[PDB]
Each structure stands twice: as structure tokens, then as C-alpha cells.
Amino acid sequence: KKHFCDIRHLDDWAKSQLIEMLKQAAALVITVMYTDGSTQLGADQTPVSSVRGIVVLVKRQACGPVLEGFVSDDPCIYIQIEHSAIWDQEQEAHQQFARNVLFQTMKCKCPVICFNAKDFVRIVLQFFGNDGSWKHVADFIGLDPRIAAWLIDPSDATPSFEDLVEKYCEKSITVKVNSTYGNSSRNIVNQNVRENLKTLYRLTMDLCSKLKDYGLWQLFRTLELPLIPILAVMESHAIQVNKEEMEKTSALLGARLKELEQEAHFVAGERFLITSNNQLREILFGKLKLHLLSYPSTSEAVLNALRDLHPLPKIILEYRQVHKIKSTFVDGLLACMKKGSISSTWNQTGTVTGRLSAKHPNIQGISKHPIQITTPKKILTISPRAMFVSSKGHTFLAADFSQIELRILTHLSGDPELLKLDDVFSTLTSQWKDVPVEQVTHADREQTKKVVYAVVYGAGKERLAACLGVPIQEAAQFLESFLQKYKKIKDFARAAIAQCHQTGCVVSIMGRRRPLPRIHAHDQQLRAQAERQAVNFVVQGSAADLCKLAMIHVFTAVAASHTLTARLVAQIHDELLFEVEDPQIPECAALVRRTMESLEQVQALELQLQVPLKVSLSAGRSWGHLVPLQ
DNA sequence: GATCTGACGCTACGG
DNA sequence: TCCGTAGCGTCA
Ligand code: NA
Question: Around A188, how many Cα atoms within 13 Å sit in the side-chain half-sphere?
Fold first, then answer.
């Protein structure tokens, strides 16, 4: 009542006093209110309602009394996001003060606690619009209890606010987050908002304490938190795509699939659903009985084993390829389009490895290598990544770590041969093809690197022999070859497993952890699975750590530069994709390289490697075609 | 009739 | 019985 104020209705002296209160506050506690009015504190991840406003709890304490007189203590202030029916001058004014207040929220020196901070920052950024850039939110730090709880239990599904309260809050704290207009009144909604913001503060503090207990605090602060505005910035931008080229390509791939469907129906001597794996399985081994010649799955390995036995596996393979490209990287990419561009949604809570994930579309899952088709009424090369074009004038600058996890593995194992080892998988592919590097095909590399991946993480002789098309004897032989050549990899794995048995958990370089209780399981498949998972997590988690660190450091570096406008557009694990203004390319590519390479040594945390990190830079007007640089 | 959904298989991405 | 993301399609 005196605890809730619309900042538009404040007298100007009270407005000034409010700005000063925000500057001198002990902590800010924030949630987004929708038109329901519901909050991020309620249970839905998707409101399916518009954003109305933002509520901020201003805490004076985390000494003496206080009388402001225009508000009580501690006050909740409300900031209208939603546009009114008519735009006019008073709306302009309201917007001016609102932007001032929200920016105060962004730059304030006290702790900011927001349940989902990325959403908040995105909303604020889009609210700034023209009077602000992405560099305004760059330094924003805010305490996201969901991220903390994720660091503690990465496996657990993304919990609601109430879940987090019952789990991490002691004790007997019951919240009502479910109030809306129409199931309740405004006063109920608001009272509950204030109470739940207090509770949110308490919860977040408790979770911070826990994070310190588990040794996750420094990781939380240095790595996860500064990443929050970076995701929001990426979600605030959009990558322009070819609506037109894409519709064409769609039509073409549709024609070709019609062809392939007809062919398959022909050669199987029946009309079966071309997209059905069940029916294909029944045909391939149901009738044809190919396994007996020399049931199994329809998977690419099996289908490649049978490629000479019958014309159907090859047909099916090509069909699956073309159908995937069209259905997913064309048609499904056309449905993600707004205004001739797309924007992915980023999830920091998505993985157990500490990796980022992306949705609608998944831009981390876009096929790297273009595919070839025979046009039905010349050869036709189709690259989905070629559909992603930079704005004009602007150009994409890509920067990736070369063989990041191999180098991580070198660091962790300390294998002398590796530590010795101008290329990597061209070397091994050359050694396997019994020829130099220069004539080695990219597909040979594609298979080989995947095979070293298989063997290092504990793959058996079976799956090994399968993926490279090897008889078991060459399987065990190749296993022993690689593991005896580099001894310290098995030692490292054996150590990681031992650690996971000891602690009941396994830990990455920067302290990110993967609890694996089934390491203690009696079931042997479960136990072995937990072991594989631990061994993989040390490396993949460490690399996730490093990639996030690079992301943050480059973002920060560009953030304070007066010249450089470079915007981080996408991240694909090992790779950072920037949209840079043309004349800024040389100066930007320089800053990017120097920054990412300096990652070899950063204090804190001790964070030192045994191997330099080679950064590969690329540039181009399209994501599909990027010419190497420098 | 036209949908909803949980589970599985296969395909891409990335190491 | 390499790991683990998303996405699309069949099936009961
Ligand atoms: Na007014």
C-alpha cells in the first residue's frame, strides 16, 4: 500500500529521492510481472502473457532509522514495460524516467537478485531500445538462484521458485506465487509479490551460502553470472536469413525426396512408409534378410554395412540426409523466422556438462558440411549455414579453439607424446591412410577424430569396430595401438574414475562438478556408465569452462572499447560467431585473438594450462562461407 | 473424424 | 556399454 508505488505517479522530488535510494541501497530484489498479473516466481516457464512491468524491492539493509515520507521501508517500486494504446509525450516522459531507473538497476553497486536474470536483462535491453546499446548491460551482475541450484544439482530438471524454496529454504516458509487478476485481486497479487521478493532474497542468500560450501562460489561469480547479460544480448539480436532461397531449396529437396521415395518403394517391392524405421526394419531383415547374408537397427552404421547387399540401404541413407536438411535446416528454419531473421533462445541451465544449449532454432545443431543433390526437373551444392548472412555493411568473424578437448586431455593426462604434438587429425589420418596429409579427405578426418573420441572416453571394441567398419580383430588391435602409444590417457581415466568413487562426484578444471551416485551402484552397466560419464565430464566440462571464460573475456574486452562495435551473435561450443562492422574487422580480429589466446594463463583461478591454445579466425559475409584470416 | 503425448530411433551439432 | 545437446518423425 505504502510498500508499492508506480514510479510514474511519484512527485519529482520523490523521483530524485528514489534514484538516490537505488544508488545507496543494500540490495535490489527484482521480478517481472506479466499481464496476469503473474510473475517469474509463479509456476510456468512460459507465461503466454505479455510483460506488463518490473517490480523492484529496495532494501536499505542486508544502520539507524529512516523516514523518506514518500515511501515506506522497504519499498517495492513498479516500472511499466507494456505500451499504452496511444503514444504521446507523457508516454515519452514516463519512458525517460523508467529508462533512467532501470539503468540505475543495471549499474548499481549493490547485489541484484532476480529469479531469471536473462529474461529480465533482455526485457530491459529491448526497453532501452535506441537510447541504449548492449554495452550498457555488459557489467550487470545479478544473483540467479536457479543458476546456483543448477550448479549444485545440474541433473535436476529446471525447478520453479516454490520448488527451490521448499528445497533450499529453512524452514517452514510457504509462499503463494499463484495469484492472478481474476483468481484474486490486485492487492493480493502485489502483497504476495512483496512477500515473495523478500523470500526470494532469503533463498538466494542461502543458495550462495551452499555454493560456498560446495566450492562452487568462485565458478558462480567469475563464470556463470557475467554470462547472463551475454545470452540476453544474443537473444536481443537477430540473424538475417534467405526466406527466398530457402523456399526454393525446400521445393527442390521436396522433389528429390519424392524421387527417392519412389525408388525405395520400387527396390523394396512394396509400398511402405519411407519415414518409418519400423517398416524399413521389417523389410530389411523381415523380408530381405540381409543380416543373414553377412534384428539389427536401421542406424547408419548397419545401413553402411549393407550398402553392397542391396540398393535400399543407400537409397534410405540419401533420403534421410536430404529429408533432414530440408525438414530441419530449411522448413523448420522458415518457421522460426520473424521479419526475415531468426533468433535462438539460450539456456544456461540446460546441461549437466556446463555447456550452453539453444532452441528455436538450435543454432548449435546447424549442419556444418553442405550436401550434394542431383537436380530433378547439373550438380547442386546446398549449405544451410550459407543461409545465414551478415547485415550490410557488416561481416561475420568466427573464432574457434582448435582441438580444444584434445589439448585439455593433454593437460590433464600429461601424456608426453601428445604434449610434444602444424596440424593434428591430418597427422593421424595420414598415418592411418598410409600417405601424407595433403591428400587426406575431410571425411577421413571426420571418421578418425570421431574414432579417437570413441577410444579415449572408454568405448569398447564393438562400437569401435562398427564406427570405422572394422573386424573385431582390428578393433582390439587399434585399441591396444592407441592406448599403448599414449599411456597416460588410461591413467587419467583411471584416476577420474577413482576420484568419482571416492567423492561420489567428479570435478572439472574451474570447479564445476558432476555428482554421479550410480558410481556406487551394484548394477554393473550403471556403474560402468557412471565411470564413462565421469571421465567424459572432466574433459568436456573443462572445455565448457574454458569456452565460457573466452566468451566472457572477449565480450568484456569489446564492452570497454570506444571504437569497437563487434557484437557476439552466436556460440557453438568451441566457436564464437561475431557480427562486426567491416572497417573494424582487423582491429576486432586482433583483439579477439589476443584475448582468447591469453586464456592459457588467467589468475584467478590458478587456471594455468600445459599447452598453448591455438585460435582459428575466419571472416565472411555468410556463415556458410568464411575465408580463413591471418 | 482430428488431435495430444510419452517413448523410442535416427540425424544433425559439438568434443 | 564413448559423452550429451536439440529436432523431427512413427508408434501405441
Ligand atoms: Na499519467
Answer: 13
CA distance A510 to A605: 7
* Cα three-residue angle A51-A240-A615, rounded to 5 degrees: 105
Q: Show which residues sit with Cβ under 7 A of nucleic chain C.
A: A 273, 275-279, 323, 327-328, 332, 335, 347, 350-353, 355, 357-362, 364-365, 450, 453-454, 456-460, 462-463, 467, 524-525, 528-529, 532-533, 536-537, 540
Q: Which three cell numbers stand for residue A352?
A: 549437466
- Evaluate whether A425 touches A403 at the Cβ level (below 8 Å): yes
Classify A486 in phi/psi space as left (phi over 0), alpha (psi -120 to 50) or beta. beta
| A506, three cell numbers | 567428479
Experimental method: X-ray
Using alpha carbons, select from A397, A392, A329 the residue that is nearest to residue A363. A329
Identify the residue whose Cα has the smallest distance to the C1' of B9. A277
Q: Strand A575-580 vs strand A395-401: parallel, antiparallel, or unpaired?
A: antiparallel
Q: Are A359 and A332 in contact (CB under 8 A)?
A: no
Please answer whether residues A571 and A400 qualify as being in contact, where contact means their C-beta atoms are separated by less than 8 angstroms: no
Q: Is A89 exposed, middle or buried (0-12, 13-18, 19+ CB in 10 A)?
A: exposed
What is the distance between the alpha carbons of residues A196 and A31, in angstroms, rounded to a whole number? 10
What's the CA gap between A173 and A151, in Å, rounded? 23
Rounded CA-CA distance A536/A184 in Å is 50
Provide the grid cell at A492: 587419467
- CA A274 to CA A264: how far, in whole Å? 8
A168 touches A149 (CB < 8 A): yes
Give A404-544's CATH code, choosing from 2.60.40.420, 3.40.1490.10, 1.10.150.20, 2.60.40.10: 1.10.150.20
Eight-state DSSP code of residue A627: E
How does DSSP classify residue A224? I
d(CA A59, CA A113): 11
Q: What are phi and psi of A8, to 5 degrees?
A: -75, -30
Instruction: Tell me the DSSP string of A292-336.
Output: HH------HHHHHHTTTT-SHHHHHHHHHHHHHHHIIIIIHHHTT
How many other β-carbons are positioned within 10 Å of the β-carbon of residue A155?
A: 11
Nucleotides on chain C that have an atom closer than 7 A to a protein CB are 1-12
* Interatomic CA distance for residues A133 and A126, integer angstroms: 9
Residue A431 (CA) to nucleotide B12 (C1'), in angstroms, measures 28
Q: Would you say A621 and A385 are in contact if contact means Cβ atoms under 8 Å apart?
A: no
HSE, side-chain direction, 13 A CA sphere, residue A4: 15
